[PDB]
Design a protein around this ligand. Sequence first.
Ligand SMILES: NC(=O)c1ccc[n+]([C@@H]2O[C@H](COP(=O)([O-])OP(=O)(O)OC[C@H]3O[C@@H](n4cnc5c(N)ncnc54)[C@H](O)[C@@H]3O)[C@@H](O)[C@H]2O)c1
Ligand SMILES: NC(=O)c1ccc[n+]([C@@H]2O[C@H](COP(=O)([O-])OP(=O)(O)OC[C@H]3O[C@@H](n4cnc5c(N)ncnc54)[C@H](O)[C@@H]3O)[C@@H](O)[C@H]2O)c1
Ligand SMILES: C[C@@H](CCC(=O)O)C(=O)O
Ligand SMILES: C[C@@H](CCC(=O)O)C(=O)O
Ligand SMILES: [Mg+2]
Lengths: 290, 291
Amino acid sequence: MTTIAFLGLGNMGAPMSANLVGAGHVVRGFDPAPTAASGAAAHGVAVFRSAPEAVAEADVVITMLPTGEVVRRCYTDVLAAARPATLFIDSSTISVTDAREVHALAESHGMLQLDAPVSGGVKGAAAATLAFMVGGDESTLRRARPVLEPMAGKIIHCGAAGAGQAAKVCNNMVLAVQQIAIAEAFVLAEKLGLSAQSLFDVITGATGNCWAVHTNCPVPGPVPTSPANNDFKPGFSTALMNKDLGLAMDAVAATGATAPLGSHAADIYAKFAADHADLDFSAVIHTLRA
Amino acid sequence: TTIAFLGLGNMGAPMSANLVGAGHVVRGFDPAPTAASGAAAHGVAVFRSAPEAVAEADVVITMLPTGEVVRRCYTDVLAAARPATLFIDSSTISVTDAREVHALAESHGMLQLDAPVSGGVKGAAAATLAFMVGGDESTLRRARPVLEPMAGKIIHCGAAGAGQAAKVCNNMVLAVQQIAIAEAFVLAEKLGLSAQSLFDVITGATGNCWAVHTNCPVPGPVPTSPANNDFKPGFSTALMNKDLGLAMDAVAATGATAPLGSHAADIYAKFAADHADLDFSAVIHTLRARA
Ligand SMILES: NC(=O)c1ccc[n+]([C@@H]2O[C@H](COP(=O)([O-])OP(=O)(O)OC[C@H]3O[C@@H](n4cnc5c(N)ncnc54)[C@H](O)[C@@H]3O)[C@@H](O)[C@H]2O)c1
Ligand SMILES: NC(=O)c1ccc[n+]([C@@H]2O[C@H](COP(=O)([O-])OP(=O)(O)OC[C@H]3O[C@@H](n4cnc5c(N)ncnc54)[C@H](O)[C@@H]3O)[C@@H](O)[C@H]2O)c1
Ligand SMILES: C[C@@H](CCC(=O)O)C(=O)O
Ligand SMILES: C[C@@H](CCC(=O)O)C(=O)O
Ligand SMILES: [Mg+2]
């Protein structure tokens, strides 16, 4: 039982914080959107007037914020407010470059810091089945584990600061490429006269099998739980995939890496996001049918 | 069951030796003497022309390099075959070619399947090939006792051409995944994320696929992957390039939109100009050619 400041109580933060309260932690919340703050208070978060106040008497500070810029600003606002050697955990999804900058800033203030971005979305968040991909020192992670367990299905140490962000962004780039490639196969099958069911049974039993087909099948019928069967309601929204791909492209640009299919997929998803940011990212299949 | 086996090359030779090993009478033809004589050494009765091999056959299997050769083989032998001979084409050819040769054979009162295969020479030798089959279910049922001794898996895909379509769609995806995995490993390295950590994450997350869990293109995480043995195939760039050409023919013939598969095909056509003999996962080292 530790005291945790939780900054950012939106679609991910609210359920995350609720599980922390359920596990017996004292949770001190801040979010400048009062609706978010109010919903969090209903589940037992003690809500404060400012982020400096929420942080003041905390052993651990979790951030679950929309961008690198917001995390940077938040750190600048609160780090001096925190007690020395408080443990900061950023579970936001932000660029590797931003992650390393904020990490260095936290340490220069005498604070411990990890990046621990997550996968699982809101459903995973509410069920406490999120995967945390953690960058930082192993000993810091050991100190953090009791805080992360109540929110987590999996905790994976990926390397030094920034490696949680790196591993996530690498996986999600691959996933985007796979989701388009699956969609392309299914439309080509359709034009060849190969049924959706038959293609599904082949690919899933063969070398092409992957989550994008076996769980996220972009045509209705073979996997009745996939978004194609429910008007492409997310699931994992195109807006979010497009955000993660922007971060992957930031990583490519910062490294001079060559990612021809990854950047092609980023370009496809940025166009699809303009009009279909609200549909599950499997809905990119629409762009392949005339 | 007497079986005429036309095409006794890298795949045909071991497949035909498995048929002999299962008690079939196997008659053979290949215009390369070394292929033929090698096949005669494991029990195939080799003939001087394909029409000769076919004469006494209940089943005719073709394992040939292109659709045009399969088509010409068919028009050379169909009049030599007995009625209701079962023709199985296990070549990898276009869906269009598959369907035309199927119509040709059935017009002569024959029964015909397309049954291309996955698994390479190793799989052919070990009798673990995956047959992806198009045609009538009642014809596949008749074919089953022949396919079985060559096969680890037999999948009915649909009507004629569905075998070719299924295999070409899966291999297009495979190509895309192998490049995507390679991109991710290079990007991880530049970010200071170790190959082992990326491997541990992706294989336990949504990006997992055979391209990483079995064909990992960096040495270490999967000690048997080609990356740990100078990228010895495995599955050659030559062959992957061939399959992607067929995917591209199918995309062109249908007016399909396949941007990443088409991109993949370009990358592999280019890589095959230099590294045809390497495992297709070696594409990880040609990414800066496209820089
Ligand atoms: N929603 C998902 O499905 C999902 C899944 C995995 C990861 N993520 C990542 O999680 C992060 C947050 O996601 P979300 O869906 O909860 O976003 P959200 O926009 O729903 O919530 C973010 C919250 O942060 C608050 N906030 C902004 N500035 C603040 C500050 N200085 N102090 C305190 N709070 C502040 C906002 O008012 C808002 O309520 C993002 O980085 C996102 O990419 C989201
Ligand atoms: N080698 C592989 O790994 C592999 C794996 C799966 C599928 N395939 C497919 O199998 C087919 C052939 O495979 P392969 O590896 O045996 O190629 P191969 O080129 O080694 O064998 C083809 C053989 O057919 C002979 N031939 C040419 N015309 C002929 C005719 N009219 N009648 C009889 N024989 C003739 C050639 O002399 C040659 O020996 C191709 O369509 C290929 O894509 C190959
Ligand atoms: C994920 C965590 C267990 C906690 C949970 O199941 O919520 C762990 O053991 O790593
Ligand atoms: C078990 C297998 C039959 C092939 C064989 O017997 O080798 C299958 O049914 O696919
Ligand atoms: Mg075709």
